[PDB]
Amino acid sequence: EVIHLDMSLDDIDSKIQNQLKKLQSPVILLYCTKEEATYIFEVAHSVG
Amino acid sequence: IWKTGPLFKRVLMSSKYPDGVTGRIEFNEDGDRKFAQYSIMNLQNRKL
């Protein structure tokens, strides 16, 4: 499932974790910029 | 970049004015103008 993330608002309403918790694939593609990839990897580093 | 930018857009989107001059100011999910005020015209004898 091609999901979409929103970087305008910080992960404070418990939504980015709910969208990234359903990724059980051996390889994941990331299509965004750098300052967004640091936040996606920052939250994903804490979730797992 | 600016961190309050998207937050400022979020505050501007959540604006309600039922007693405004134009009518009822209300934003939708994309940031446009709801409750548009138009007028259906018809060309009659070279006149609108």
Backbone phi, then psi, for B18, in 5-degree steps? -70, -20
Is B7 in the A-facing interface, judged by CB distances under 8 Å? yes
Residue of B nearest to A7 (CA): B6
Residue of B nearest to A8 (CA): B6
**Which technique was the structure solved with, according to the deposited record?**
cryo-EM
Report how far apart, in Å, the C-alpha atoms of A11 and of each of A1, A44, B7, B36, B43 are.
Answer: 21, 11, 13, 34, 55
3-state SS of chain A is CCCCCCCCCCCCCCCHHHHHCCCCCCCCCCCCCHHHHHHHHHHHHHHC
